Amino acid sequence: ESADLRALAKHLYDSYIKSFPLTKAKARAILTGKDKSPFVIYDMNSLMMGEDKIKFKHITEVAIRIFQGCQFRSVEAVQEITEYAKSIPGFVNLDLNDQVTLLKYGVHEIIYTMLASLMNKDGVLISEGQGFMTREFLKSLRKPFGDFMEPKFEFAVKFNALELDDSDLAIFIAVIILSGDRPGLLNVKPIEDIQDNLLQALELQLKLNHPESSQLFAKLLQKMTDLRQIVTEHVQLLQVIKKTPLLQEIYK
Amino acid sequence: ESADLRALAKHLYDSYIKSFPLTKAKARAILTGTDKSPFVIYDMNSLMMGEDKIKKEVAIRIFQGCQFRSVEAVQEITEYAKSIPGFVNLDLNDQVTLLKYGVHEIIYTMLASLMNKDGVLISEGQGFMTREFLKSLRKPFGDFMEPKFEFAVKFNALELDDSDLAIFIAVIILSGDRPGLLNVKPIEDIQDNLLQALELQLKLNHPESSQLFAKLLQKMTDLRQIVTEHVQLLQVIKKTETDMSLHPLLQEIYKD
Numbered sequence: 001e002s003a004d005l006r007a008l009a010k011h012l013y014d015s016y017i018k019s020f021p022l023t024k025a026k027a028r029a030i031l032t033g034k035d036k037s038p039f040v041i042y043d044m045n046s047l048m049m050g051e052d053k054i055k056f057k058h059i060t061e062v063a064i065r066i067f068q069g070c071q072f073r074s075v076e077a078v079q080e081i082t083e084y085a086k087s088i089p090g091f092v093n094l095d096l097n098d099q100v101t102l103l104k105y106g107v108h109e110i111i112y113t114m115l116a117s118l119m120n121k122d123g124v125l126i127s128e129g130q131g132f133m134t135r136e137f138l139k140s141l142r143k144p145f146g147d148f149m150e151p152k153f154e155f156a157v158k159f160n161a162l163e164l165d166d167s168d169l170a171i172f173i174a175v176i177i178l179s180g181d182r183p184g185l186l187n188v189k190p191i192e193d194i195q196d197n198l199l200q201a202l203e204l205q206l207k208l209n210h211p212e213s214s215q216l217f218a219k220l221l222q223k224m225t226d227l228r229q230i231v232t233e234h235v236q237l238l239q240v241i242k243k244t245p246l247l248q249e250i251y252k
Numbered sequence: 253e254s255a256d257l258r259a260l261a262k263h264l265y266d267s268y269i270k271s272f273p274l275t276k277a278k279a280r281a282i283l284t285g286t287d288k289s290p291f292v293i294y295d296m297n298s299l300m301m302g303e304d305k306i307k308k309e310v311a312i313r314i315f316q317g318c319q320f321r322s323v324e325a326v327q328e329i330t331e332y333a334k335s336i337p338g339f340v341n342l343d344l345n346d347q348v349t350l351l352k353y354g355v356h357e358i359i360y361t362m363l364a365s366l367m368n369k370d371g372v373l374i375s376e377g378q379g380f381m382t383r384e385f386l387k388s389l390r391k392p393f394g395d396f397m398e399p400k401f402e403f404a405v406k407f408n409a410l411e412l413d414d415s416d417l418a419i420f421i422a423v424i425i426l427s428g429d430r431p432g433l434l435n436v437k438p439i440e441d442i443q444d445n446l447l448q449a450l451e452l453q454l455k456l457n458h459p460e461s462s463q464l465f466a467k468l469l470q471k472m473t474d475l476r477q478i479v480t481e482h483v484q485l486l487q488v489i490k491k492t493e494t495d496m497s498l499h500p501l502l503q504e505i506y507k508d
């Protein structure tokens with residue numbers, strides 16, 4: 001029934017808004033046109049001044065302090081994604097261990113999806129969109145830190161060409177969380193059933209919200225491959241840094 | 253709005269459950285009496301047989317035991333803390349400062365769940381070490397555990413369940429009065445909302461328990477005192493037992 005699907009689409013849209021302070025639409029505006037624009041970081045000099053103008057909550061060598069900052073924020077996004085997951089109908093009724101398993105394996109995927117919303121070919125919004133860090137400044141970081149972020153830019157550029165909006169992404173992120181193939185799952189059935197319902201919703205959303213965009217649904221599901229590659233790749237990059245107190249415990 | 257507060261109570265209960273394998277409810281069901289029956293350790297020979305049956309000098313290896321398990325508890329508390337709304341958004345220095353001071357307070361709160369007047373569950377519930385065996389240990393390990401027993405006896409008379417504790421330990425972590433905090437106010441606003449949640453919880457979950465909220469807040473004094481005696485005990489050991497090792501995660505917590 002179209003109606004239940006639209007209802008679910010709306011429900012997720014409203015929860016995405018409440019959970020994710022910095023939305024795609026707001027980020028878009030920030031990247032385009034002005035009004036008070038954000039502070040730009042494009043060199044060493046500018047980073048330093050940015051510390052003083054954008055009070056960093058992560059600030060307890062440069063390349064590392066930048067890496068720690070991505071850590072602080074992705075820890076914050078986990079909390080946001082966790083809260084959003086609880087609004088997805090059926091999610092809280094699942095086995096608790098499965099809930100934890102879906103969030104653990106799903107959050108990197110969702111982070112890099114939503115980070116795309118904050119990126120363009122030239123850089124990425126930071127600090128709830130009051131900063132902009134350029135792509136080239138990210139690449140110039142001593143190796144191996146130079147290309148931590150290049151892959152995400154490559155992905156976002158391609159991903160952003162689908163022209164999704166927040167209302168589309170709300171459902172897509174839901175579909176990602178409910179992936180029945182995560183390791184260690186105890187009762188895959190209700191996960192897949194909820195995933196099926198979300199997939200039907202996503203399909204109707206895309207067809208309605210983008211009637212002239214041929215097979216968008218398919219193309220969007222195909223991107224879930226590019227996500228998983230960005231993830232295995234990121235994790236390998238972490239293992240390389242790890243080989244070259246309470247703080248640890250926070251960032252396990 | 254009591255609805256937002258109940259929502260917050262639910263959220264904290266859910267995370268407590270996800271973060272802490274051995275709950276108060278599970279511990280009590282074990283201490284009552286089954287297939288969940290623990291092995292009891294009450295004497296030296298007894299220690300030895302339980303080594304075989306459960307997962308240096310005696311007194312030390314018991315102390316290293318309590319030390320390994322505090323390391324584990326810190327890891328669990330750290331995970332739980334991040335689920336508390338607003339915690340991870342605070343300045344990182346403050347996050348570290350709140351965990352440093354709040355962690356032992358929570359360890360002794362939660363250890364009460366594992367205790368009764370006669371002893372304490374160990375090894376996730378597989379074992380039970382009697383209070384007397386712990387008292388008899390060569391000094392200064394003799395009454396390392398007595399203070400915690402005295403607290404637990406009094407604390408357990410409040411009859412809290414895990415859903416109450418989830419909020420209470422949230423209130424403990426978010427204390428704006430820790431030394432060296434940078435931005436006391438955001439912490440206090442979080443605490444205020446947690447305190448309101450705790451008050452609605454206690455009133456709803458224990459309607460006949462007069463002023464339980466107050467009595468619970470007063471227990472924060474017994475906690476701070478437990479924390480003080482322990483640290484002094486560690487400094488005795490560091491000079492008696494130059495040969496005994498202390499886990500660095502714990503070391504950082506105590507050092508300051």
Ligand SMILES: O=C(/C=C/C=C/c1ccc2c(c1)OCO2)N1CCCCC1
Binds near residue numbers: 303307313372381
């Ligand atoms: O020496 C030990 C274990 C010692 C545990 C010791 C211990 C003491 C107080 C505690 C605690 C653990 O947890 C909370 O409070 N063994 C007996 C059990 C099997 C392994 C060896």
